[PDB]
Amino acid sequence: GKPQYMVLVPSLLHTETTEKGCVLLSYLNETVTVSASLESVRGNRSLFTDLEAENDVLHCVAFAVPKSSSNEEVMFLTVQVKGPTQEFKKRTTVMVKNEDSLVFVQTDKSIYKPGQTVKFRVVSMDENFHPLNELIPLVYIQDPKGNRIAQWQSFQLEGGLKQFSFPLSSEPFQGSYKVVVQKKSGGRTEHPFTVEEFVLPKFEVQVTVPKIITILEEEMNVSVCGLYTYGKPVPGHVTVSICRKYSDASDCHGEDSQAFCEKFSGQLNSHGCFYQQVKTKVFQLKRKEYEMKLHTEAQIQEEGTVVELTGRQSSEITRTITKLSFVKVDSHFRQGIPFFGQVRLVDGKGVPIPNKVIFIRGNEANYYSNATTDEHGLVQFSINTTNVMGTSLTVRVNYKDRSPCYSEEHEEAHHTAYLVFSPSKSFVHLEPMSHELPCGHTQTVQAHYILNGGTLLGLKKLSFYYLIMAKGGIVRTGTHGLLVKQEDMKGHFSISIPVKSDIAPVARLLIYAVLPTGDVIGDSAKYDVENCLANKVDLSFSPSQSLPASHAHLRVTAAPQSVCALRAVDQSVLLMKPDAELSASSVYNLLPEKDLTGFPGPLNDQDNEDCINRHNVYINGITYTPVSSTNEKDMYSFLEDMGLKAFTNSKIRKPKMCKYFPETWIWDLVVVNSAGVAEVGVTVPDTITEWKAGAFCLSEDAGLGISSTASLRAFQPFFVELTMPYSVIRGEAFTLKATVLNYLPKCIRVSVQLEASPAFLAVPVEKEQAPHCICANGRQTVSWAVTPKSLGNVNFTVSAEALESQELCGTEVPSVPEHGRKDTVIKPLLVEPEGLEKETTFNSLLCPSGGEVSEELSLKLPPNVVEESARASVSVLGDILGSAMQNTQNLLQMPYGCGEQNMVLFAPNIYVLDYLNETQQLTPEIKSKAIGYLNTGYQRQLNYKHYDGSYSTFGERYGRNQGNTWLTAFVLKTFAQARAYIFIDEAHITQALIWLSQRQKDNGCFRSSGSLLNNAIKGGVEDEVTLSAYITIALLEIPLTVTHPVVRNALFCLESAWKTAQEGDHGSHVYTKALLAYAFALAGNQDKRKEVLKSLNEEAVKKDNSVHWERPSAEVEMTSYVLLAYLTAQPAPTSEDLTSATNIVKWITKQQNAQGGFSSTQDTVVALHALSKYGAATFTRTGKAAQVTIQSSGTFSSKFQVDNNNRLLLQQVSLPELPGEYSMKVTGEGCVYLQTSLKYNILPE
Ligand SMILES: *[C@@H]1O[C@H](CO)[C@@H](O[C@@H]2O[C@H](CO)[C@@H](O[C@H]3O[C@H](CO)[C@@H](O)[C@H](O)[C@@H]3O)[C@H](O)[C@H]2NC(C)=O)[C@H](O)[C@H]1NC(C)=O
Ligand SMILES: *[C@@H]1O[C@H](CO)[C@@H](O[C@@H]2O[C@H](CO)[C@@H](O)[C@H](O)[C@H]2NC(C)=O)[C@H](O)[C@H]1NC(C)=O
Ligand SMILES: *[C@@H]1O[C@H](CO)[C@@H](O[C@@H]2O[C@H](CO)[C@@H](O)[C@H](O)[C@H]2NC(C)=O)[C@H](O)[C@H]1NC(C)=O
Ligand SMILES: *[C@@H]1O[C@H](CO)[C@@H](O[C@@H]2O[C@H](CO)[C@@H](O)[C@H](O)[C@H]2NC(C)=O)[C@H](O)[C@H]1NC(C)=O
Ligand SMILES: *[C@@H]1O[C@H](CO)[C@@H](O)[C@H](O)[C@H]1NC(C)=O
Ligand SMILES: *[C@@H]1O[C@H](CO)[C@@H](O)[C@H](O)[C@H]1NC(C)=O
Ligand SMILES: *[C@@H]1O[C@H](CO)[C@@H](O)[C@H](O)[C@H]1NC(C)=O
């Protein structure tokens, strides 16, 4: 028959990973060889790869491509054939992008105590989950503000798992922390963990309210169990509530934002938890509702009165009922072989309804069948295939459009099966599957086929091919031969495929059969697969062990000679805030490109080959230009949805014309000895609750696996627990609550005592110390009014034991059951100083600037400060402004719109570009992307001049004869700054200047004559003083001497207007005064600059060691301008200038928002310009060295080295001394910001 070649590769070639490839040869009368060459566009980088080919049977090849300098290069793949019979060449560009290798996170908990450390392991592995060694360049921890407490430079991952033991300071501030592991390929990956002060609770509430609820409902089930230790609910005054939230919940933030709830409360006996039946009258789902959130408080009364606000929102309203859903339906119906659709009836809740008659919209042949549901609500129906283009299948249950005002109907099932292009009237049917593929448990896949006079030369041997793709690449292959010498009809061809970890959550199967007529038939099928892992891991224990059962053998089974990580925490750790899952496809969703939906490359758009014309009418009757505008499903459908390139000699296309510290538990590393490893982890002598754990071992042979959560039921028949707050004031007294628990069946009496220490006082609240009647499943609760004396953390001790052989209340009196009789607990408690706490700040800036500066620490304490309440901290920052740095890069946006609109869009592009350039943090790729936006914005603005430069919204368009004044000054400023990047024609800004000079009366100074629709770009108040001061700084920022007449006449108005706003209303003109400050600063009028800046400082609003202004919307605008005023000095920006300048920068960074837009146009413009100038005046191109040494006049000094690569790091030290006997001398290059603060307490008044 006719020869044909067949080779297939995925069109998202990952750089480093060897991507598999398929070769296939069909009907050649000699052996030939084929070589695939990876040539590159516009550059030279080739990968010649000769892959062997067999004339009848296929095999697989692998080729690894070099790492690309560019991130996503779209380069060619040239598949070539050497052979005397034929020399075939097809070439398309597929993709190469450097794959960001997956990176995990750890850090056991997301709530940490102040004096608690973080262990922080991290795992980085590529698509094939056996890991690789990667040089991670940076990993650091960020505070709520944007500071980096710790930082690690470049390091290598020997095995792919590194622990980073970092301790916190004494009292790190507590809003929320987060950790960033920035991969060497740019885009960082983050993970937070909040820090706060607390006391860990034990009881978990699990209210089982139906998450699924009908729109027609009456009864609400709920049960409230608390298994704080082992399932011993110790029923207390538990209260729950069902809170339906109204539509637009809390969208109206005026005088009312509350939602109506339905509270419930009660107790329990021993085992039944809480059985509350809730009616449905205000459980109104008729209209205006989103979801019932539920918050519960399981107060315990038989112990300390600690309450835990616990909100479980596991309840949602379902708008629909009787949900109908296709589960196993062919998107590929085929003329000749009928298809059967598996449609499923199920309630809107999720329970199928058996024996319900259903009507089916078969829009093909009017196939209306009254099928009824089975026990699973799942029917069967086949539709014969005699139609034109494509069948639409839909289901019927109700027809009803009911009373609703304008929400209550039953959701229907829609599907659009499309025909497969059968050129030789032939096609292969492949059975789809809906159930999740079991792992290990394999599965055979049924298939069907048809010939219709195709196999003329093909006879007695028809191999039947398949290529499973997973993770966006070819994974499994196979073949099977068919014995046919006939005109063979449909057949049953179950094909077997095992299911190992090498299958992604998606499993895609393609089957194509080679035919001697050239044309080939195929069928694709997606398969959802449970995410399984090559290393099945199990966690073993010596469970139900006592708290002092020290040995506590921890056995873990994993792949032979692997590396295992073992995290062990408390159950409360997962209770107070659920931590990262790190399990059950936690890696799989982070996997980039889990499937290839289409040709993944956005640049990979189209293909064009063998386009026929055929624009002629043919055989009549109803020719209608012979064929339907094919929405048909040919092989590009089966291979693009597959996601790979078809390098075929076959014709395929559509023709297509034109007790000790718990705090944690086992966190270590263990190595499998080719059979599995046990670890002897000493269990903590504290009995609090279950200890969940993790196990995510890695190996080079078998990939990563994740085992399970498995606990240690650390329980004692007799123990105590302490109910405390996290801290308490020294001057005040709290009441310690301590309960003593008995659960061994013997009925006993406990004597409870507190061993007092001179660090505190403790007095029982009860007059009598006689032991009370405590028995099985019963507890006593004693108290102590406790006031501490010693500062810092002090650990208490409470001793409870059963008094031996005292015939008492209990009918039987076996007081001491076991060797364990005394229960001595040791638990710390934070002790904060008394009085009102005040913190001052001594923030400052120093620049050695190729030399040396100095500063003396003036630290004094008022006499009313209590003893040892002063905590002095000095922080060395560097501060290249890493806070408002990353979000700024996303202000580079596309220019469009009117003249006014374009300035919203074009202007920020240039100042963000200048900011990134000043901070030395800008990549050439983003610079090239942004320069295009700059040019487009500029050359779209050039289409709005009326004349020499007078702009407006419409401009010369529509024959408008008018002109805006302020907008022209704004564009003059922007182009003046542009001259340094794209060298905007100075003739244009010159013409704009000569037009602005037209608006110049004697001393009136630029009355506005402009009309504009919006005013958000604005921010001057149109007052002649305000506009004059802005336009002067605009047309003087461009290098323009003060002797020039326009600025000379503007400065007279400035001097008169500043006096007039000084003699008149004090304040009320702070924005104008800041503009005057910047104008005088940039015009060299220092003798007036000092006076204006001191007036502003008198009018300033200083809050949290950061100075701000505001009108007594655009409040940030004047802050940036006064920052310029303090920064722009003719001789040099003095140290005193910069020290006050930083106090405005901090809020300018914190004003950022989504994509760092700074909430406005003009504000973003001015703030980015301000930050750029600050960076220019602060940083150093050659700042490769520095030195900061703070010398005490007492005992010890401190030293620091903050160079450019460490300039982000907030190096912080605390020097204990109340007097200011401290001094800093800073030498070397660069600039060093030093913020110093002390916290102290003053009780009296
Ligand atoms: C983007 O890069 C810079 C900001 O990150 C800045 O250009 C820099 O400005 C300095 C200061 O004048 C210049 O350094 C050179 O200045 C003159 C040039 O003849 C000479 O004394 C020395 O050769 C000195 O190196 C440079 O022009 C430049 N420095 C750099 C890039 O290290 C501008 O914001 C932007 N510059 C460009 C070219 O786009
Ligand atoms: C079989 O061997 C013959 C030997 O002559 C070759 O026939 C060539 O077939 C191709 C079609 O694929 C034609 O383009 C050439 O013109 C043929 N050769 C000549 C000399 O005419 C070829 O090696 C093999 N052909 C087939 C169809 O398998
Ligand atoms: C559609 O249903 C009809 C019978 O219900 C069948 O179609 C017949 O097909 C034969 C030959 O294939 C023709 O001679 C008849 O004229 C057809 N009858 C009708 C009513 O179309 C067949 O069972 C179904 N069609 C297919 C392709 O399976
Ligand atoms: C906690 O109490 C103990 C004594 O009651 C002191 O520190 C402990 O001393 C024992 C003595 O062997 C050690 O085994 C423990 O490890 C110590 N505790 C810690 C946390 O290390 C001390 O009075 C208290 N500790 C603190 C930090 O307040
Ligand atoms: C590609 O062509 C350039 C052209 O000068 C040559 O320098 C280079 O060595 C060639 N090979 C590679 C791998 O770049
Ligand atoms: C919900 O409460 C009703 C009220 O009696 C009861 O019949 C039903 O069994 C309860 N549901 C469950 C799951 O127990
Ligand atoms: C069900 O079959 C057809 C399809 O709707 C309908 O005409 C008929 O009346 C129904 N009942 C029976 C007994 O066929």
CSV table of C-alpha atoms in Angstrom, one decimal, residues 569-706:
chain,number,residue,atom,x,y,z
A,569,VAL,CA,2.9,18.3,66.0
A,570,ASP,CA,-0.1,18.5,68.4
A,571,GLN,CA,-3.7,18.0,67.5
A,572,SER,CA,-4.3,21.5,68.7
A,573,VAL,CA,-1.7,22.6,66.2
A,574,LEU,CA,-4.0,21.6,63.4
A,575,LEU,CA,-7.0,22.8,65.5
A,576,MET,CA,-6.4,26.5,66.2
A,577,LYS,CA,-5.4,27.1,62.6
A,578,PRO,CA,-5.4,24.3,60.0
A,579,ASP,CA,-1.9,24.1,58.6
A,580,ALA,CA,-0.7,23.4,55.0
A,581,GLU,CA,-2.0,20.1,53.7
A,582,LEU,CA,1.3,18.9,52.2
A,583,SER,CA,-0.7,15.8,51.3
A,584,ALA,CA,-3.3,14.3,48.9
A,585,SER,CA,-2.2,16.0,45.7
A,586,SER,CA,-0.8,19.1,47.5
A,587,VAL,CA,2.1,18.7,45.0
A,588,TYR,CA,-0.2,17.9,42.1
A,589,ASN,CA,-2.1,21.2,42.0
A,590,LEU,CA,1.3,23.1,42.3
A,591,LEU,CA,2.4,21.0,39.3
A,592,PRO,CA,2.7,23.4,36.4
A,593,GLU,CA,0.8,22.4,33.2
A,594,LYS,CA,-0.9,19.3,34.6
A,595,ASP,CA,-2.5,18.9,31.2
A,596,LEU,CA,-2.2,20.3,27.7
A,597,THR,CA,-5.7,21.7,27.0
A,598,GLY,CA,-4.7,22.8,23.5
A,599,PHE,CA,-1.5,23.8,21.8
A,600,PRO,CA,-0.2,25.4,25.0
A,601,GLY,CA,1.9,28.0,23.4
A,602,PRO,CA,0.0,31.2,22.9
A,603,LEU,CA,2.5,31.9,20.1
A,604,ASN,CA,1.7,28.4,18.8
A,605,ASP,CA,-1.4,29.6,17.1
A,606,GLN,CA,-2.2,27.8,13.8
A,607,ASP,CA,-1.1,25.5,11.0
A,608,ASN,CA,-1.5,25.9,7.3
A,609,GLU,CA,-0.8,23.1,4.7
A,610,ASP,CA,-2.9,21.7,1.8
A,611,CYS,CA,-5.6,24.4,1.7
A,612,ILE,CA,-7.8,23.5,-1.2
A,613,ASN,CA,-10.1,26.0,-3.1
A,614,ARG,CA,-13.1,23.9,-4.2
A,615,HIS,CA,-15.2,27.1,-4.4
A,616,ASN,CA,-17.5,25.5,-6.9
A,617,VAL,CA,-21.0,24.2,-6.5
A,618,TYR,CA,-21.3,20.4,-7.0
A,619,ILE,CA,-24.0,17.6,-7.1
A,620,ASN,CA,-27.5,19.1,-6.6
A,621,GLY,CA,-30.7,18.3,-4.9
A,622,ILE,CA,-29.8,20.2,-1.7
A,623,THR,CA,-26.1,20.9,-2.4
A,624,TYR,CA,-26.1,24.0,-0.2
A,625,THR,CA,-22.3,24.4,-1.0
A,626,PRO,CA,-21.9,20.7,-0.2
A,627,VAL,CA,-21.0,20.6,3.5
A,628,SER,CA,-22.0,22.0,6.9
A,629,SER,CA,-19.7,24.6,8.3
A,630,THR,CA,-17.9,21.8,10.1
A,631,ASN,CA,-18.0,22.0,13.9
A,632,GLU,CA,-16.9,18.4,13.4
A,633,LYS,CA,-14.2,16.7,15.5
A,634,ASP,CA,-11.2,15.5,13.4
A,635,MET,CA,-7.7,14.5,14.4
A,636,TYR,CA,-6.5,18.0,15.3
A,637,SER,CA,-9.3,17.8,17.8
A,638,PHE,CA,-8.0,14.5,19.1
A,639,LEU,CA,-4.4,15.7,19.2
A,640,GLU,CA,-4.7,19.3,20.3
A,641,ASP,CA,-7.0,18.4,23.1
A,642,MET,CA,-4.3,15.8,23.5
A,643,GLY,CA,-1.8,18.6,23.2
A,644,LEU,CA,0.9,17.4,20.9
A,645,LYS,CA,2.3,17.9,17.4
A,646,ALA,CA,1.3,15.4,14.6
A,647,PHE,CA,4.3,15.0,12.3
A,648,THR,CA,2.4,12.7,9.9
A,649,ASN,CA,2.6,11.8,6.2
A,650,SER,CA,-1.1,10.9,6.4
A,651,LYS,CA,-3.8,13.3,5.3
A,652,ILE,CA,-5.6,14.5,8.5
A,653,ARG,CA,-7.0,18.0,8.3
A,654,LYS,CA,-10.4,19.2,7.4
A,655,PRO,CA,-10.0,20.5,3.9
A,656,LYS,CA,-11.1,23.9,5.1
A,657,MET,CA,-11.4,26.0,1.9
A,658,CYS,CA,-9.4,29.3,1.9
A,659,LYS,CA,6.4,16.8,82.8
A,660,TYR,CA,8.5,18.6,80.2
A,661,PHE,CA,8.3,21.0,77.2
A,662,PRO,CA,5.9,19.6,74.6
A,663,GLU,CA,5.9,22.6,72.1
A,664,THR,CA,6.3,20.1,69.3
A,665,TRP,CA,7.2,16.5,68.7
A,666,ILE,CA,9.5,14.4,66.5
A,667,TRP,CA,11.0,16.6,63.7
A,668,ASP,CA,14.0,14.9,62.3
A,669,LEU,CA,15.5,13.2,59.2
A,670,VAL,CA,15.7,9.4,58.8
A,671,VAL,CA,17.1,7.2,56.0
A,672,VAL,CA,15.6,4.0,54.8
A,673,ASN,CA,18.0,1.0,55.0
A,674,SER,CA,16.6,-0.6,51.8
A,675,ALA,CA,13.7,-2.0,53.9
A,676,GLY,CA,12.3,0.9,56.1
A,677,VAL,CA,13.4,2.8,59.2
A,678,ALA,CA,12.2,3.1,62.8
A,679,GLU,CA,13.0,6.0,65.0
A,680,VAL,CA,13.1,6.0,68.8
A,681,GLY,CA,11.4,9.3,69.7
A,682,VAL,CA,11.1,10.1,73.3
A,683,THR,CA,7.4,11.0,73.8
A,684,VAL,CA,6.9,14.2,75.8
A,685,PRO,CA,5.7,13.7,79.4
A,686,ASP,CA,2.7,16.1,78.7
A,687,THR,CA,-0.6,14.5,78.2
A,688,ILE,CA,-2.5,17.2,76.3
A,689,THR,CA,-3.9,15.4,73.3
A,690,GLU,CA,-3.3,13.5,70.0
A,691,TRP,CA,-0.1,14.2,68.0
A,692,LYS,CA,-0.7,14.3,64.3
A,693,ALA,CA,2.3,13.7,62.0
A,694,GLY,CA,3.6,13.8,58.5
A,695,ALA,CA,5.8,11.6,56.2
A,696,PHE,CA,6.8,12.7,52.7
A,697,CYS,CA,9.9,10.7,52.0
A,698,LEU,CA,11.9,11.2,48.7
A,699,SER,CA,14.0,8.8,46.7
A,700,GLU,CA,15.9,8.9,43.4
A,701,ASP,CA,14.5,5.4,42.4
A,702,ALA,CA,10.9,6.0,43.5
A,703,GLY,CA,9.4,9.5,43.5
A,704,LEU,CA,8.0,11.4,46.4
A,705,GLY,CA,5.1,9.9,48.4
A,706,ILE,CA,3.0,11.2,51.3
